Paper text:
Mitochondrial ATP synthase consists of the soluble F1 and membrane-bound Fo subcomplexes and occurs in dimers that assemble into oligomers to induce the formation of inner-membrane folds, called cristae. Although overall dimer architecture varies among eukaryotes, we find that [name] together with [name] form an ancestral oligomerization motif, which is shared between the trypanosomal and mammalian lineages.
Using masked refinements, maps were obtained for the membrane region, the rotor, and the peripheral stalk. The presence of ordered water molecules in the aqueous channel is consistent with a Grotthuss-type mechanism for proton transfer, which would not require long-distance diffusion of water molecules. Instead, it may occur via the adjacent H155a. The e/g module is held together by four bound cardiolipins in the matrix leaflet, anchoring it to the remaining Fo region.
Author numbering:
A (entry chain i): 2 to 104
B (entry chain q): 14 to 98
C (entry chain a): 1 to 231
D (entry chain m): 16 to 144
E (entry chain r): 1 to 62
F (entry chain f): 2 to 136
G (entry chain n): 18 to 156
H (entry chain c): 29 to 92
Write the structure that this text describes.
């Protein structure tokens, strides 16, 4: 005779279990998952340094800085960003050359 | 302190980082790709389910006029109480 | 931020696969009351009052695979976080509460207004209703808080006592060869007694806490069940 | 101080009477009759036998060496022999480590004069130890 | 549930069942690791780190 | 029509890997399928020998993981911080010196809250290096 | 006699269980551990009592084989899977799952490094993903 | 205390959500329902034997 | 359960077969007599 | 008897005193493993799993493994 | 707890019998029934 648990394959039984046996629980769980990934999925660099490392943050090599450096280099190279543009520096290119000659 | 440190997961393998802007934009592109075709009319429940709530939430954000300051969600340092910037 | 990690149950999953490829009878259940809600015969309920049995059984198995085996040194309770337990209890409790609320029977809440018509409605009965509605949510919070605090305190105490025992055993056993050997033997016997007592207490407390955890959920369900009499 | 001694003697006497080994009881009775010590006699018999079996041990060692070298030992190798060999290897490792510690007469390796840990030696609380 | 099974009467019987053989081996490890720590960490030639005051976990967690 | 929803749609023959599977089931069934092996909610069996075997094994592999993966991080941090603040500085030491340092870390662990506090608190007048030694 | 298991009991004593009437009682007054009739059923007393049945060589008058017409029911359906077939399927599945879990356990507890090491000799320190590519207008 | 922390709470809770949504069905089909069917078998066998005896008894009682 | 035949019987299984086998009455009588004798000696 | 928390199961008597007294005990039919059977020590004559492997030998094996675990780095130290 | 049976049309008391914060809002004060929360609760 036919039974869901014995005759249906696992994915089918999973859908049946969470749709005709525990639909409200599945709905609430999905709601909570969305909330968690909407409000509890971020960590600042300072938070990582304080609590993000098992034995403590290794300032002697500063892996966060290396990670950010790789990130920004990748973005600049892939997106063809001109980091010498006045908006990034706040001054014209000629003024930048003057500053380079000064310092 | 040391006893408190025993209460941590012991099988951490990898940590990945992604900006909210980047993956939100990618998700929007996916949604536009799947909701673009002609055979899904704008009046279908699927299209409205995809679009209306997001539009409403973004409108609520735009209409917001708060007298207080909300610090940037993704600052480099959010642990200092006396420095919202 | 996306952290990839694994639970501490992989060996236990292997054992479950090895030992439960064939069927076995189950006759001992931590929370048996989920199976017997009605004690007077001819009473029956039109509500799905046995819906909690499956979730109860799975929750007991999961929490037992974690909490009971955590007494073994260096075994990790992977889920031991306050807000994660809040999420679990939120799921179960709010799901059942919304099941009762989706029924769209407002008379079901008549019992929230505590007291009789003799009591003043605004200054007594309404305030009691406010307190009872508050108490439902407080019951959810207390359930998850109790489960978290018991585990945390028990394991803190075990860790501290184990550290003390290691210290005295390693750095003061030489007194067995000295003239103050009787003091060390007394202390060592006391430490052994406390060790056994702590382990027994934790073993009992884990099962008791799981029983109470399931009892809270079943109490939520029972508070809104109405039984008809067969005629 | 006397009650405790009497209690210990009574307990040991009960345990001695309890054992149901014919040889042990016979030896105990004979030595009690003669007033001699059974345990010391057992020790002397053992040492005499071992003194007379030394060259038997040597012959057995050479026979076992021939048995191993000839390959007959490995022909009938089983899992039990594997367990025994693992036990043997573990004892060899532990004995090598203990021998090293005794040979250098120190649990830890000695510190070289050019090491930065020499300060630790200089700042000993008790130079005698 | 602790209902039944082989139960050695005394130490000498632990070798009458493979599972209890493994158990007594493990008990040997457990109890024998303490004497080893006594010998190793109460040794005459054990020396505290000269730079133990350069850094400590007490600094870091504070 | 593409995939069956029924478990009865077999993908292999009934005799596929029969021998190894039967050996695996023999291993599973010999100690577990017994009257006295009555479990408590599937987690705590009644057979004593299951405890006698599994408690040591679980402890052993957990301890190996802790010693070689988790505590090693703290040990390496202490070595790096106390002897230069860099990995190369530690590697400038010999294996014997590193052994001494690591065993001192073990000592600190074993005292923990009960050992002498001079292991990390410098008494006044002590001649050993302080916290500003490498700064 | 062999060493095979019998009908599972769950560690329960059938002389005091809630369904004791479902278990036949023998001459000695010990209820069976199974729906079958057992002559040598016993009860053992640990912390809790439990019923045990010891298989033995016993001869039973065997009624001759009936015809297939009177006991075979050909009502099988496409969804139907017999208990024997289910046992076979589950045995194979659990064998493969056990092997996979064994490999996972070995890797996790003996090969997998922990992330974010202080020294940097083992494990990853993390990195960013989903970064934009080929979108100059984005900056 | 990490038990009081929230900086990786979502990834942490994914363990519970995976256990609930993906492992519970497997435990349901492979362990729990089988055990309860096994528990059911004896009483059903007894009741059906009694029902068959009742049918035979009724068959005999109608003869005269 | 032919696949289990190779495993044989361990000490506990042999004890159970001995106590609950065809010789169960003899073992029960011997055990009870021995226990009664020990109880009498204790008193 | 007990070994820590593990208690040895005991079979309940099934015969009455009258029936029991009429039973004739013949240990010649008993297996050699169980002769002079004692409920307080049923495994006294039980064979060893490995001939010559004592319980003390296994205990000592574990002790030696622990000593190796703690002392190997003292003889063969390795660099970070 | 127990089953709830709605009152019959004849078992419902008249509105004039209900009391407000201070007193019954009978004729000439009926329209104040809308504003008195306690009267609505009692009703
Ligand atoms: C008539 C034909 C006769 C033919 C005769 C042929 C005879 C010779 C043999 C033939 C050759 C062998 C055939 C296969 C044998 C397999 C083993 C076996 O026998 O198993 C028993 C059994 C034999 O079949 P059966 O018993 O006859 O019938 C089965 C029943 O009918 C129904 O079964 P069920 O429903 O009850 O259960 C099925 C399944 C439940 O159902 C499923 O799981 C199916 C669905 C799973 C989906 C998972 C992926 C989802 C991803 C997200 C979605 C993506 C969407 C993408 C969309 C498009 C994007 C563009 O159950 C399970 O999951 C439990 C069993 C799991 C087995 C253990 C697996 C790990 C073993 C590891 C061992 C090795 C370790 C490492 C060793 C290293 C050494 C150094 O097979 C199964 O149970 C099937 C298991 C299938 C599991 C699939 C998992 C896939 C995971 C990897 C996915 C990779 C994706 C990559 C994507 C990359 C993108 C970049
Ligand atoms: C091609 C797929 C379909 C394309 C689209 C089709 C047309 C539209 C469909 C309907 C759209 C609904 C729109 C929202 C309705 C209202 C709800 C709401 O507020 O939503 C907020 C937000 C959506 O944002 P929005 O309101 O549209 O506006 C954007 C805002 O600017 C953002 O503002 P915000 O502040 O809220 O933003 C924060 C963040 C917030 O984002 C979140 O909180 C994400 C939450 C995800 C919830 C997932 C629900 C299903 C859970 C199933 C159970 C899992 C148990 C745990 C398992 C753990 C281990 C895997 O939002 C996002 O970045 C949104 C990204 C959403 C990505 C969804 C990816 C799903 C992956 C599922 C993986 C399952 C793995 C199972 C493997 C098993 C193998 C055996 O999140 C969601 O709606 C999440 C649910 C989305 C469901 C999509 C349809 C089903 C899934 C199809 C893809 C399956 C991929 C499988 C990959 C497998 C890899 C192995
Ligand atoms: C960039 C670097 C790489 C990483 C990229 C990642 C990309 C991420 C995208 C963004 C995602 C954002 C959100 C992340 C949230 C994470 C949250 C989280 O972790 O929560 C904790 C939570 C912890 O859960 P749990 O309690 O530990 O249980 C989950 C376990 O999986 C165990 O649970 P269970 O046992 O219940 O699971 C069912 C299990 C049932 O049991 C089994 O089936 C047994 C096996 C278990 C396998 C799974 C366990 C894994 C153990 C560790 C790894 C094993 C060794 C790997 C070796 C790697 C070597 C480098 O069955 C399976 O696992 C089905 C799969 C079986 C595969 C069998 C493959 C056989 C291949 C044979 C080939 C033979 C070839 C022969 C050729 C011959 C030629 C001559 O995680 C989850 O719930 C799952 C999170 C997953 C989220 C989706 C991620 C996206 C998918 C990534 C796939 C990457 C594939 C490419 C990798 C290539 C190598 C580098
Ligand atoms: C830095 C380098 C320094 C190097 C310095 C130089 C090194 C030496 C170089 C050479 C020097 C010249 C040669 C001198 C040789 C002297 C030894 C000798 O010949 O021995 C043979 C001699 C027997 O010869 P015999 O009289 O001709 O025998 C006739 C028959 O052959 C009899 O045959 P048998 O059948 O009787 O055979 C068994 C007999 C023979 O066995 C032996 O041969 C034993 C091994 C002989 C060598 C022992 C050397 C001892 C040197 C000091 C310790 C070093 C470690 C020794 C390790 C031994 C491990 C077994 O067993 C015994 O002797 C048993 C002795 C133990 C009795 C245990 C009774 C305890 C009762 C406690 C009750 C307390 C109640 C208090 C109630 C209070 C209420 C208020 O036995 C002894 O002298 C035994 C001495 C045992 C001393 C043990 C001290 C241990 C440390 C104190 C205890 C701390 C822990 C416990 C505290 C508990 C709290 C109270
Ligand atoms: C170190 C600091 C520690 C602080 C600790 C604080 C405690 C943290 C506890 C975390 C663990 C426990 C979490 C339990 C769950 C909490 C749930 C919660 O409050 O989430 C609310 C939040 C509220 O969402 P929200 O925050 O996005 O609200 C949007 C409101 N505006 C736009 C004005 C900003 O829910 C979610 O995050 C999920 C939202 C999506 C799912 C629901 C969609 C349907 C909504 C229906 C109504 C509106 C649309 C119209 C009708 C439908 C039309 C189709
Ligand atoms: C239903 C009730 C069940 C009760 C079971 C009671 C078990 C009694 C155990 C007696 C002592 C056992 C000692 C084992 C020694 C192992 C080796 C060792 O070194 O360990 C030392 C370890 C730790 O000892 P330690 O702390 O002294 O270690 C010193 C190590 N240093 C100095 C480095 C820190 O011992 C333990 O942790 C043992 C505690 C056991 C507590 C009981 C756990 C019960 C729950 C798990 C049951 C598992 C059953 C699985 C069955 C299959 C399921 C499908
Ligand atoms: C539906 C496809 C339409 C277009 C035609 C594509 C043909 C591609 C060539 C395929 C050659 C190999 C075929 C092998 C037999 C496949 C049999 C099959 O489908 O079995 C499904 C079976 C599952 O069986 P059950 O769920 O138990 O139920 C089955 C009975 N109800 O699935 C499997 O085991 C996987 C088998 C995969 C075979 C390859 C399928 C490739 C499909 C490609 C489609 C896309 C177009 C390809 C064009 C190719 C041009 C050269
Ligand atoms: C080559 C070895 C020879 C062995 C001979 C041993 C003879 C010893 C006899 C006297 C022993 C007691 C001495 C009392 C004082 C000891 C003080 C002490 O700790 O000494 C350590 C030496 O201690 C050790 O290393 C060993 C400690 C104890 C070891 C225990 C041995 C094994 C015990 C097994 C126990 C198992 C259970 C048995 C129970 C029986 C008893 C109840 C060195 O001291 P310092 O160098 O001054 O301080 C160092 C700090 N910078």
């Amino acid at each position: 005779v036919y039974t869901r648990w014995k005759c249906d394959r696992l994915p089918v039984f999973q859908l049946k279990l969470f749709t005709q046996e525990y639909p409200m629980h599945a709905a609430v769980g999905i709601f909570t998952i969305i909330f968690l990934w909407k409000h509890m999925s971020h960590c600042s660099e300072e938070t990582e340094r304080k609590y993000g490392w098992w034995a403590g943050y290794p300032y002697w090599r500063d892996p966060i800085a290396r990670r950010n450096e790789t990130k920004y280099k990748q973005m600049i190279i892939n997106n063809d960003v001109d980091i010498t543009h006045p908006k990034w520096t706040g001054c014209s290119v000629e003024q930048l050359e003057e500053l380079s000659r000064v310092v | 302190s040391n006893p408190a440190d025993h209460f941590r997961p012991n099988l951490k393998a990898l940590t990945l980082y992604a900006e909210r802007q980047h993956y939100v934009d990618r998700w929007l592109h996916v949604k536009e790709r799947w909701l673009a075709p002609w055979y899904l009319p704008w009046w279908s429940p699927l299209f409205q389910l995809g679009t209306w709530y997001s539009q409403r939430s973004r409108n609520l954000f735009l209409v917001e006029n708060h007298l207080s300051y909300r610090p940037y969600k993704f600052r480099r340092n959010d642990e200092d109480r006396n420095n919202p910037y | 931020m996306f952290l990839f990690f694994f639970c501490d149950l992989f060996w236990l999953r292997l054992l479950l696969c090895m030992y439960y490829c064939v069927w076995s009878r189950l006759c001992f259940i931590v929370y048996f009351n989920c199976l017997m809600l009605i004690f007077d015969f001819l009473l029956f309920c039109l509500f799905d009052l046995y819906l909690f049995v499956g979730l109860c059984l799975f929750l007991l198995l999961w929490f037992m695979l974690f909490n009971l085996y955590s007494l073994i040194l260096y075994y990790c309770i992977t889920y031991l976080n306050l807000y994660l337990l809040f999420c679990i209890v939120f799921l179960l409790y709010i799901a059942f509460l919304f099941l009762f609320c989706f029924l769209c029977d407002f008379f079901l809440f008549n019992n929230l207004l505590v007291g009789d018509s003799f009591m003043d409605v605004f200054f007594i009965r309404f305030l009691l209703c406010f307190l009872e509605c508050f108490s439902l949510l407080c019951r959810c919070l207390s359930t998850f808080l109790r489960l978290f605090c018991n585990l945390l305190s028990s394991h803190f105490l075990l860790l501290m006592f184990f550290d003390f025992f290691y210290f005295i055993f390693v750095f003061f056993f030489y007194g067995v060869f000295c003239y103050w050997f009787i003091l060390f033997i007394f202390v060592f016997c006391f430490c052994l007694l406390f060790y056994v007592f702590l382990y027994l207490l934790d073993l009992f407390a884990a099962i008791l806490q799981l029983f109470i955890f399931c009892n809270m959920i079943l109490q939520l369900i029972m508070d809104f069940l109405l039984f008809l009499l067969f005629v | 101080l006397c009650n405790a001694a009497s209690k210990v003697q009574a307990r040991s006497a009960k345990k001695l009477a309890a054992l149901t080994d014919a040889g042990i009881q016979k030896t105990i009775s004979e030595h009690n009759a003669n007033g001699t010590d059974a345990a010391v006699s057992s020790t002397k018999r053992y040492l005499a036998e071992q003194r007379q079996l030394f060259h038997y041990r040597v012959v057995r060692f050479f026979d076992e060496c021939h048995y191993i070298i000839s390959g007959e030992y490995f022909a009938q190798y089983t899992k039990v022999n594997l367990i025994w060999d693992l036990r043997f290897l573990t004892k060899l490792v532990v004995l090598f480590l203990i021998g090293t510690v005794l040979g250098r007469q120190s649990i830890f390796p000695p510190i070289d004069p050019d090491s930065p840990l020499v300060e630790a030696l200089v700042t000993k609380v008790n130079p005698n130890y | 549930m602790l209902l039944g099974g082989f139960v050695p009467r005394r130490f000498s019987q632990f070798n009458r069942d493979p599972c209890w053989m493994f158990f007594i081996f493990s008990v040997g490890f457990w109890l024998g690791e303490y004497p080893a720590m006594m010998i190793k960490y109460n040794a005459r030639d054990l020396v505290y780190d000269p730079h133990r005051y350069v850094w400590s976990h007490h600094d870091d967690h504070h | 029509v593409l995939f069956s929803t029924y478990r009865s749609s077999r993908l292999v023959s009934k005799e596929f890997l029969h021998g190894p599977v039967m050996r695996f089931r023999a291993l599973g069934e010999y100690y577990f399928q017994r009257a006295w092996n009555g479990t408590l909610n599937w987690a705590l069996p009644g057979e004593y020998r299951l405890y006698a075997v599994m408690i040591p094994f679980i402890y052993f592999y957990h301890r190996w993981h802790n010693d070689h993966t988790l505590d090693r991080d703290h040990v390496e941090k202490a070595m790096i911080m106390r002897w230069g603040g860099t990995l190369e500085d530690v590697r400038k030491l010999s294996a014997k010196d590193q052994l001494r340092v690591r065993c001192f870390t073990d000592i600190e662990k074993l005292y923990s809250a009960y050992g002498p506090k001079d292991t990390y608190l410098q008494p006044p007048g002590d001649t050993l290096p302080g916290k500003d030694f490498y700064r | 006699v062999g060493n095979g298991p019998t009908f599972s009991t769950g560690g329960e004593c059938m002389n005091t269980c809630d369904i004791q009437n479902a278990f036949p009682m023998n001459d000695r007054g010990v209820r069976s551990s199974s729906p079958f009739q057992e002559p040598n059923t016993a009860i053992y007393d640990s912390y809790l009592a439990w019923t045990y049945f010891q298989p033995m060589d016993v001869h039973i008058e065997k009624l001759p084989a009936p015809e297939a017409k009177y006991y075979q029911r050909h009502t099988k359906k496409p969804w139907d899977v017999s208990s024997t077939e289910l046992t076979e399927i589950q045995s194979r599945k659990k064998y493969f799952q056990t092997l996979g879990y064994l490999v996972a356990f070995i890797y996790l507890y003996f090969l997998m490094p922990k992330e974010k090491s202080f020294s940097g000799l083992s494990g990853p320190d993390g990195h960013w993903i989903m970064l934009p590519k080929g979108r100059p207008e984005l900056f | 205390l990490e038990p009081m922390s929230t900086w990786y709470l979502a990834s942490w809770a994914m363990v519970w959500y995976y256990a609930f949504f993906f492992w519970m069905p497997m435990v349901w089909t492979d362990i729990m329902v089988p055990s309860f069917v096994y528990n059911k078998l004896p009483v059903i066998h007894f009741l059906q034997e009694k029902r068959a005896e009742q049918k035979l008894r009724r068959v005999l009682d109608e003869t005269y | 359960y032919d696949h289990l035949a190779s495993w044989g019987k361990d000490a506990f299984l042999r004890r159970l077969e001995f106590e609950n086998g065809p010789l169960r009455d003899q073992v029960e009588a011997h055990t009870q007599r021995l226990l009664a004798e020990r109880a009498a000696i204790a008193k | 008897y007990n070994m820590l928390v593990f208690r040895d199961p005991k079979r309940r008597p099934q015969l009455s005193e009258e029936e029991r007294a009429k039973v004739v005990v013949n240990q010649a039919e008993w297996p050699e493993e169980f002769k002079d059977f004692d409920p307080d020590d049923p495994y006294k004559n039980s064979p060893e799993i490995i001939k010559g492997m004592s319980s003390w030998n296994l205990f000592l094996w574990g002790v030696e493994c622990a000593f190796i675990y703690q002392f190997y780095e003292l003889v063969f130290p390795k660099s970070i | 707890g127990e089953l709830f049976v709605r009152p019959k049309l004849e078992e419902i008391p008249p509105a004039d019998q209900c009391r407000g914060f201070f007193g019954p809002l009978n004729d000439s004060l009926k329209f104040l029934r809308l504003l008195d929360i306690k009267w609505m609760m009692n009703r």
